[PDB]
Amino acid sequence: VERISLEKAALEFSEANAPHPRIYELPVEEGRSLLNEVQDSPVVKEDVDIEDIAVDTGEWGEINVRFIRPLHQEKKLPVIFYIHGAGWVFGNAHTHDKLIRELAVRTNSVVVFSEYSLSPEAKYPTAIEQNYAVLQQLKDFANDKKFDVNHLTVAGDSVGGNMATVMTLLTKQRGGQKIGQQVLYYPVTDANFDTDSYNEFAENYFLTKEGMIWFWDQYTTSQEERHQITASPLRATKEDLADLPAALIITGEADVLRDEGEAYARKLREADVEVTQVRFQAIIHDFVMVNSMNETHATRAAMSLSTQWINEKNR
Amino acid sequence: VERISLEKAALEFSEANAPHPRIYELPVEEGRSLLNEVQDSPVVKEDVDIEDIAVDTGEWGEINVRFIRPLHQEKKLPVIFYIHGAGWVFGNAHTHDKLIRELAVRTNSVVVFSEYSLSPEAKYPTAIEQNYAVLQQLKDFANDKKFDVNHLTVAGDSVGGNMATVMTLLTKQRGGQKIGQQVLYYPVTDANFDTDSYNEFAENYFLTKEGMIWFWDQYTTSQEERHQITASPLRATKEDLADLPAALIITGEADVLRDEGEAYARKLREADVEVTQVRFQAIIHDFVMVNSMNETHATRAAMSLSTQWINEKNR
Ligand SMILES: [Cl-]
């Protein structure tokens, strides 16, 4: 099979995910299991205290929220609100465990991780409403969980990066809990399947054009919903994006979502938002989450850049 | 006229250098003055101990070699050999002052900065042999200057990056002083003017196609010499590149040199060399050196990544 230059682990993850049936061609409960089994593979995880709290989002129901804290910290820590990815269909505290532990320890922060309702059982805009409601209840936990809600970062990977930047939109529109800055790992920004990266990396790079069409189909099949800026933030006007929190936007070269991530970065920059946009060569979608890609140069450099950038923000 | 999305400081520096005559249309002496003047503009510089030594390169004559040291450091520090850019025609310890002080402090390293002979007065291969000569003498200054030669990083910007990576090939060919790793900021890697980035960014982004044609003409007009892997390292075979030191290669989006930098990273990775390749969006050539670009998101992210990458190496 013909591919561009990739890190060994990215090539191996691409080859391992080429055979049919792929993850998005399984009954959604078997897909969810397969990602869990993928994320059982060997990795060194930083050390944290974990607390699972049921949080009531009101109209949008009760979800588990996981609170993660580095060991032996007496002081009031900054807080990171982390929204997981994996296509609105998969993922949980276990799939993203290595990533959020690394963020907690290297930024010396509490990580708050919403287990939002998954598609297709939950449709747009349930996940974004539940995530926005948890953000409004962070002040309610700030004292018992020893974090400072005035040192607030929102972050997410893929579909989670989509909802993370959408948290900044909803907050500006509804005057909610101030967000200092946002970190989007290889986000979804648009329900369009015709960008040059979508065309070039359509097949053979683990995340496929066909799979992304399916993920959007699980989230909502309404064109009117997909055109809302809280589904496709790439569609935001200059006036919509003005005064949003400072953003770090990380892309990989061999990713269908590369161009829409880089395009969204240019739109924020044109709206005078502070933007740090970096593309890592020779790497595929999902590289800061997947355990087997934990050692890639892209992963090591992405985590060094992201943790440092947040550390600089908090002080 | 019109440019892709750029950071404010990159746009301003592009416009300032739009009108004729440009720096490469001046006599070489006014060229050198213009760049010295540009680097008089105000910027925060870290504090350091500085020391100008004459070093004898044998055949290629005696050159000034600057040692930079972070204040109040009672240990043997790691060392970085830094080869400056600016087209082989310009640059000196003044033009690169801000950058080498930041590298010294944030890596807690001595910075050894060879003031190699400039072109056209000197031709290929003088500058690379002088730089190579100083490398083999580092073990001899190691004690007065308290550094450990077994924690040796070579680094360079643009033609400095060219000559830095060429130091690693000469070292391998000759059994010279072992280099741990190499940092290339937007390197020159090939005497070809026909890459997609050369065409797209040929004009309006400060560094022009015509500018690079002239810089190469000052260095050597010989097509035979340009085909040499010690002039155009992109032309190296897999066998030439095998076992070279671990590489960090940084590129800017809005840079004629972007593609040949990215292409050289692929060739190193295909030769099983450890490569960290990162492209920063919306930034022009020279962004880690030029004082007026010191606060760009690109410059801050490139300094944070490259300094942490070097620190992790020195363990
Ligand atoms: Cl299918």
Numbering used by the authors:
A (entry chain A), B (entry chain B): 2 to 316
From the article:
The three-dimensional structure of LgEstI was determined using X-ray crystallography at 2.0 Å resolution. An LgEstI crystal contained three monomers per asymmetric unit. Superposition analysis revealed that each monomer was almost identical, with a root-mean-square deviation (RMSD) of ~ 0.3 Å (Cα), including most of the water molecules surrounding the monomers. The monomer can be divided into two domains: a CAP domain and an α/β hydrolase domain. The CAP domain is made up of three triangular helices, α1, α2, and α8, whereas the α/β hydrolase domain consists of a 90-degree twisted β sheet in the center, five neighboring α-helices (α3, α4, α6, α10, and α11), and turns connecting helices and strands. Careful investigation of the active site of wild-type LgEstI indicated that two of the three monomers had a triangular blob at the tip of the hydroxyl group of Ser159. The crystallization condition included 0.1 M calcium acetate hydrate; therefore, we incorporated acetate into the blob as it had a 0.5 reasonable density fit value. The acetate moiety was positioned at the bottom of the active site and surrounded by Val160, Met213, His286, and Asp287 within hydrogen bonding distances, and an oxyanion hole consisting of Ala87 and Gly88. The oxygen atom interacts with the NE2 of His286, and the methyl group of acetate is directed toward Val160 for hydrophobic interactions. Unlike other esterases, LgEstI contains bulky residues such as Trp89, Phe194, and Trp217, which block the acyl chain channel.
In this study, we performed an in-depth biochemical and structural characterization of a novel microbial acetylesterase, LgEstI, from the bacterial fish pathogen Lactococcus garvieae. LgEstI belongs to the HSL family of α/β-hydrolases and presents a clear substrate preference for a short acyl chain and an acetate moiety that are suitable for the narrow entrance to the active site. Monomeric LgEstI exhibits a canonical α/β hydrolase fold with conserved key active site residues. The active site of LgEstI has the typical catalytic triad of esterases, identified as Ser159, Asp256, and His286, and is located at the bottom of the substrate access channel.
